[PDB]
Design an enzyme around this catalytic site. Structure first.
Site, PDB file in Angstrom:
ATOM      1  N   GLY A 148      42.427   1.888 -24.936  1.00 59.69           N
ATOM      2  CA  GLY A 148      43.404   1.006 -25.545  1.00 59.69           C
ATOM      3  C   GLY A 148      42.735  -0.031 -26.437  1.00 59.69           C
ATOM      4  O   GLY A 148      43.078  -0.159 -27.613  1.00 59.69           O
ATOM      5  N   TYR A 154      34.195  -4.074 -27.236  1.00 59.45           N
ATOM      6  CA  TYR A 154      33.142  -3.447 -26.439  1.00 59.45           C
ATOM      7  C   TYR A 154      31.792  -3.425 -27.161  1.00 59.45           C
ATOM      8  O   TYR A 154      30.880  -2.694 -26.740  1.00 59.45           O
ATOM      9  CB  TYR A 154      33.526  -2.009 -26.039  1.00 59.45           C
ATOM     10  CG  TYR A 154      34.817  -1.816 -25.235  1.00 59.45           C
ATOM     11  CD1 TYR A 154      34.844  -1.999 -23.847  1.00 59.45           C
ATOM     12  CD2 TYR A 154      35.992  -1.402 -25.864  1.00 59.45           C
ATOM     13  CE1 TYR A 154      36.026  -1.798 -23.105  1.00 59.45           C
ATOM     14  CE2 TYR A 154      37.180  -1.206 -25.149  1.00 59.45           C
ATOM     15  CZ  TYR A 154      37.192  -1.390 -23.775  1.00 59.45           C
ATOM     16  OH  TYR A 154      38.369  -1.184 -23.086  1.00 59.45           O
ATOM     17  N   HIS A 160      34.936  -7.675 -23.906  1.00 53.99           N
ATOM     18  CA  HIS A 160      34.802  -6.836 -22.715  1.00 53.99           C
ATOM     19  C   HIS A 160      33.357  -6.550 -22.342  1.00 53.99           C
ATOM     20  O   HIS A 160      33.105  -6.154 -21.197  1.00 53.99           O
ATOM     21  CB  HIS A 160      35.517  -5.499 -22.893  1.00 53.99           C
ATOM     22  CG  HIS A 160      36.999  -5.623 -22.913  1.00 53.99           C
ATOM     23  ND1 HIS A 160      37.675  -6.439 -22.036  1.00 53.99           N
ATOM     24  CD2 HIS A 160      37.934  -5.064 -23.716  1.00 53.99           C
ATOM     25  CE1 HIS A 160      38.970  -6.373 -22.295  1.00 53.99           C
ATOM     26  NE2 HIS A 160      39.152  -5.547 -23.309  1.00 53.99           N
TER      27      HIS A 160
HETATM   28  C1  LIG Z   1      45.978   2.220 -15.475  1.00 49.38           C
HETATM   29  C2  LIG Z   1      45.442   2.071 -16.874  1.00 49.38           C
HETATM   30  C3  LIG Z   1      44.222   1.431 -17.079  1.00 49.38           C
HETATM   31  C4  LIG Z   1      43.701   1.277 -18.365  1.00 49.38           C
HETATM   32  N1  LIG Z   1      42.481   0.632 -18.525  1.00 49.38           N
HETATM   33  C5  LIG Z   1      42.009   0.498 -19.737  1.00 49.38           C
HETATM   34  C6  LIG Z   1      40.734  -0.172 -19.906  1.00 49.38           C
HETATM   35  O1  LIG Z   1      40.038  -0.643 -19.008  1.00 49.38           O
HETATM   36  N2  LIG Z   1      40.325  -0.264 -21.221  1.00 49.38           N
HETATM   37  C7  LIG Z   1      41.008   0.217 -22.326  1.00 49.38           C
HETATM   38  O2  LIG Z   1      40.508   0.059 -23.444  1.00 49.38           O
HETATM   39  N3  LIG Z   1      42.206   0.849 -22.157  1.00 49.38           N
HETATM   40  C8  LIG Z   1      42.669   0.976 -20.923  1.00 49.38           C
HETATM   41  N4  LIG Z   1      43.879   1.601 -20.745  1.00 49.38           N
HETATM   42  C9  LIG Z   1      44.578   2.122 -21.925  1.00 49.38           C
HETATM   43  C10 LIG Z   1      44.295   3.601 -22.160  1.00 49.38           C
HETATM   44  O3  LIG Z   1      42.901   3.811 -22.384  1.00 49.38           O
HETATM   45  C11 LIG Z   1      45.075   4.095 -23.378  1.00 49.38           C
HETATM   46  O4  LIG Z   1      46.467   3.895 -23.164  1.00 49.38           O
HETATM   47  C12 LIG Z   1      44.815   5.578 -23.641  1.00 49.38           C
HETATM   48  O5  LIG Z   1      43.453   5.752 -24.035  1.00 49.38           O
HETATM   49  C13 LIG Z   1      45.745   6.193 -24.665  1.00 49.38           C
HETATM   50  O6  LIG Z   1      45.561   7.625 -24.657  1.00 49.38           O
HETATM   51  P1  LIG Z   1      46.770   8.604 -24.886  1.00 49.38           P
HETATM   52  O7  LIG Z   1      46.291   9.934 -25.333  1.00 49.38           O
HETATM   53  O8  LIG Z   1      47.674   8.609 -23.650  1.00 49.38           O
HETATM   54  O9  LIG Z   1      47.554   7.887 -26.059  1.00 49.38           O
HETATM   55  P2  LIG Z   1      48.995   8.308 -26.563  1.00 49.38           P
HETATM   56  O10 LIG Z   1      49.836   7.097 -26.754  1.00 49.38           O
HETATM   57  O11 LIG Z   1      49.554   9.336 -25.575  1.00 49.38           O
HETATM   58  O12 LIG Z   1      48.692   8.998 -27.937  1.00 49.38           O
HETATM   59  C14 LIG Z   1      48.324   8.226 -29.100  1.00 49.38           C
HETATM   60  C15 LIG Z   1      49.189   8.630 -30.271  1.00 49.38           C
HETATM   61  O13 LIG Z   1      48.821   9.952 -30.723  1.00 49.38           O
HETATM   62  C16 LIG Z   1      49.995  10.693 -30.954  1.00 49.38           C
HETATM   63  N5  LIG Z   1      49.698  12.117 -30.821  1.00 49.38           N
HETATM   64  C17 LIG Z   1      49.964  12.929 -29.756  1.00 49.38           C
HETATM   65  N6  LIG Z   1      49.585  14.177 -29.921  1.00 49.38           N
HETATM   66  C18 LIG Z   1      49.039  14.181 -31.181  1.00 49.38           C
HETATM   67  C19 LIG Z   1      48.446  15.206 -31.964  1.00 49.38           C
HETATM   68  N7  LIG Z   1      48.313  16.473 -31.550  1.00 49.38           N
HETATM   69  N8  LIG Z   1      47.996  14.875 -33.192  1.00 49.38           N
HETATM   70  C20 LIG Z   1      48.124  13.616 -33.613  1.00 49.38           C
HETATM   71  N9  LIG Z   1      48.659  12.576 -32.971  1.00 49.38           N
HETATM   72  C21 LIG Z   1      49.095  12.926 -31.766  1.00 49.38           C
HETATM   73  C22 LIG Z   1      51.009  10.159 -29.954  1.00 49.38           C
HETATM   74  O14 LIG Z   1      52.337  10.441 -30.368  1.00 49.38           O
HETATM   75  C23 LIG Z   1      50.692   8.665 -29.995  1.00 49.38           C
HETATM   76  O15 LIG Z   1      51.406   7.993 -31.023  1.00 49.38           O
HETATM   77  C24 LIG Z   1      44.422   1.777 -19.457  1.00 49.38           C
HETATM   78  C25 LIG Z   1      45.639   2.417 -19.258  1.00 49.38           C
HETATM   79  C26 LIG Z   1      46.157   2.568 -17.977  1.00 49.38           C
HETATM   80  C27 LIG Z   1      47.479   3.267 -17.793  1.00 49.38           C
HETATM   81  C1  LIG Z   2      44.774  -3.284 -26.402  1.00 47.76           C
HETATM   82  C2  LIG Z   2      44.600  -2.750 -24.982  1.00 47.76           C
HETATM   83  O1  LIG Z   2      45.080  -1.592 -24.512  1.00 47.76           O
HETATM   84  N1  LIG Z   2      44.761  -1.392 -23.202  1.00 47.76           N
HETATM   85  C3  LIG Z   2      44.045  -2.477 -22.801  1.00 47.76           C
HETATM   86  C4  LIG Z   2      43.468  -2.699 -21.404  1.00 47.76           C
HETATM   87  C5  LIG Z   2      44.282  -2.582 -20.289  1.00 47.76           C
HETATM   88  C6  LIG Z   2      43.755  -2.783 -19.026  1.00 47.76           C
HETATM   89  C7  LIG Z   2      42.419  -3.105 -18.876  1.00 47.76           C
HETATM   90  C8  LIG Z   2      41.604  -3.228 -19.992  1.00 47.76           C
HETATM   91  C9  LIG Z   2      42.131  -3.020 -21.253  1.00 47.76           C
HETATM   92  C10 LIG Z   2      43.936  -3.370 -23.939  1.00 47.76           C
HETATM   93  C11 LIG Z   2      43.196  -4.711 -23.969  1.00 47.76           C
HETATM   94  O2  LIG Z   2      42.037  -4.696 -23.731  1.00 47.76           O
HETATM   95  N2  LIG Z   2      43.874  -5.971 -24.273  1.00 47.76           N
HETATM   96  C12 LIG Z   2      43.197  -7.272 -24.305  1.00 47.76           C
HETATM   97  N3  LIG Z   2      41.760  -7.175 -24.045  1.00 47.76           N
HETATM   98  C13 LIG Z   2      41.005  -8.067 -24.975  1.00 47.76           C
HETATM   99  C14 LIG Z   2      42.020  -9.036 -25.640  1.00 47.76           C
HETATM  100  N4  LIG Z   2      41.821 -10.478 -25.496  1.00 47.76           N
HETATM  101  O3  LIG Z   2      40.718 -10.903 -25.431  1.00 47.76           O
HETATM  102  O4  LIG Z   2      42.738 -11.211 -25.400  1.00 47.76           O
HETATM  103  S1  LIG Z   2      43.637  -8.265 -25.714  1.00 47.76           S
END
Ligand SMILES: Cc1cc2nc3c(=O)[nH]c(=O)nc-3n(C[C@H](O)[C@H](O)[C@H](O)COP(=O)(O)OP(=O)(O)OC[C@H]3O[C@@H](n4cnc5c(N)ncnc54)[C@H](O)[C@@H]3O)c2cc1C
Ligand SMILES: Cc1onc(-c2ccccc2)c1C(=O)Nc1ncc([N+](=O)[O-])s1
Ligand SMILES: Cc1cc2nc3c(=O)[nH]c(=O)nc-3n(C[C@H](O)[C@H](O)[C@H](O)COP(=O)(O)OP(=O)(O)OC[C@H]3O[C@@H](n4cnc5c(N)ncnc54)[C@H](O)[C@@H]3O)c2cc1C
Ligand SMILES: Cc1onc(-c2ccccc2)c1C(=O)Nc1ncc([N+](=O)[O-])s1
EC number: 1.6.5.2
Lengths: 272, 272
Positions: A148, A154, A160
């Protein structure tokens, strides 16, 4: 190398992670590879180690100790069949791709549980052959992570912290512990804030990269030969290596930073 | 403080981990704490995030996205009741103890899933209230870890590498990211290789520590005020802060090592 295994840890087939798996499979196939899949959510894979991973009587059910019990079940052919099927996907594979969203700064619980149930002692490591000696030393593994957060969060100065520190526990402690050569992780950041035309390019660069993945140079870990691999020694770095390293400016590794500077991108970039 | 939550991640009541949980409970109860448990195995806690965590109609079931959907569900009161029951326990707790064996260099999968399903957005963190501004900033968390490997394997020259690196993703990325003040971990090494008398001293040692745990100094993480917390700047360390740090020998922490030496036991010892 000619066989690849793709482990995917995502519940949604509409996800970009799923699309990254599909793209890896197409590219590898088109290039001559056999690709086998472990779509953990689709497999409804069970990630909780328990005494039900042993099929049959237990060595000591009153004092149940999972590593000893599961090693014994592996030697005797008494592991739950869903574990055995994964271990054989591993045995067959030359290349292993782990495709997952980063969750709370490591692997999803479903994939973490996959390691704990499938990487059994003896099968995936012994203490007589750790790290670069490991059972998987002919195989190559690569993490393909989406996040995300953005790349900069990072970076060394991002809120982070160094991604390289986040990757260390997985790439050294899990993959390379078992002998895997670890390739450079594919890191796709802030995927939910990427415009459509970029996502398309990301999938092309991934497929492009897989066209020659087997030729790449793996990350650097300190070789196990630098260490006295026995308890009397403490599995400490050899005296003569410590001496040799007092001169040096950099630690060897994220984990073997030795209180000095960590080599840049140790867990992200192979040595150029 | 008054109210303690102990989360245990171990399947066996005969385990030392279980004895650690029993000891912590008695020691705090004797000093007048209310104590609540989440014994994940005894609860047979479901550790897999899914659409099933949102009771009722989804916002966009055609593209399920867990962060937005779970957050919406949390705001609207549609989280699955088991999730909700653990969020209740956490709201009431001043102190949270995580008691677990170290497994593949992190938390057991059942605890990883517990974080993933229970630390929901808005409940546990916001874009606007990360880290030291986090919702749990009035609360203190501590890790009580047992390991198979011994202490020297995890020293700066142990073959496994610095335990401080291993702890970083958990203590900074999970606990502190949600605002917890993270106390020094309780690190009991090579527990399967420890004679009974030492084992009893560890239990007594742990109980003695818990007599004043609330008065302890927490671990050091870079404060968030050192960062420009906005996408325009990329959540990079502030300009003035980088400058002033260019003349410092040590980084701020394991994650913010800024390519320099990591301060000793940043993740294991509070600052004098
Ligand atoms: C419990 C939890 C913990 C998390 N912890 C962290 C963390 O510590 N650090 C962090 O950075 N993030 C964190 N996240 C966020 C997470 O990493 C992101 O939400 C995730 O990486 C998104 O991946 P996705 O494929 O599901 O995205 P999606 O939203 O499913 O996909 C991204 C986009 O691509 C589109 N797409 C789909 N298929 C295709 C295709 N074939 N071609 C082109 N586009 C396409 C989709 O429609 C969408 O718009 C966390 C999330 C959760 C739920
Ligand atoms: C965008 C995003 O999508 N998923 C996450 C996430 C969810 C759970 C754990 C870790 C990351 C995320 C995010 O990192 N938001 C904030 N981190 C730094 C920012 N700040 O300093 O305020 S904003
Ligand atoms: C899948 C998996 C992955 C692992 N990964 C790692 C890893 O990456 N790194 C690592 O270092 N280790 C790892 N381990 C090992 C793990 O950390 C240890 O095996 C575990 O901590 C053992 O602790 P236990 O609670 O099971 O105690 P046990 O092994 O069950 O027993 C320890 C001793 O404590 C005694 N005892 C129990 N209760 C009491 C009591 N009340 N009073 C006094 N004595 C008591 C018992 O008699 C026994 O002698 C892994 C293990 C598994 C199964
Ligand atoms: C003892 C012990 O108990 N559990 C583990 C363990 C299991 C899975 C993953 C990580 C650790 C363990 C152990 O680490 N033995 C090795 N440490 C360094 C050694 N070497 O260099 O050869 S031998």
């Amino acid at each position: 190398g000619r066989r690849a295994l793709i482990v995917l840890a995502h519940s949604e087939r509409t996800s970009f992670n799923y699309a990254m798996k599909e793209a890896a499979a197409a590219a590898l196939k088109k290039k001559g590879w056999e690709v086998v899949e472990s779509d953990l959510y689709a497999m409804n894979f069970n990630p909780i180690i328990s005494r039900k991973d042993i099929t049959g009587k237990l060595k000591d059910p009153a004092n149940f100790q999972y590593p000893a019990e599961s090693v014994l079940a592996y030697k005797e052919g008494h592991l739950s069949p869903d574990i055995v099927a994964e271990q054989k996907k591993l045995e067959a594979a030359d290349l292993v791709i782990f495709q997952f969203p980063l969750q709370w700064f490591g692997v999803p619980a479903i994939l973490k549980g996959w390691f704990e149930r499938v990487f059994i002692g003896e099968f995936a490591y012994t203490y007589a052959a750790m790290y670069d000696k490991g059972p998987f030393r002919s195989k190559k593994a690569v993490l393909s992570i989406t996040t995300g957060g953005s790349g900069s969060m990072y970076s060394l100065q991002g809120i982070h912290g160094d991604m390289n520190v986040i990757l260390w526990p997985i790439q050294s402690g899990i993959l390379h512990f078992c002998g895997f050569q670890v390739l450079e992780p594919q890191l796709t950041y802030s995927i939910g804030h990427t415009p459509a035309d970029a996502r398309i390019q990301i999938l092309e660069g991934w497929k492009k990269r897989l066209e020659n993945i087997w030729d790449e140079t793996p990350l650097y870990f300190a070789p196990s030969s630098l260490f006295d691999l026995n308890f009397q020694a403490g599995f400490l770095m050899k005296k003569e290596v410590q001496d040799e390293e007092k001169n040096k400016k950099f630690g060897l590794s994220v984990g073997h930073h030795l209180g000095k500077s960590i080599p840049t991108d140790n867990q992200i970039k192979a040595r150029k």
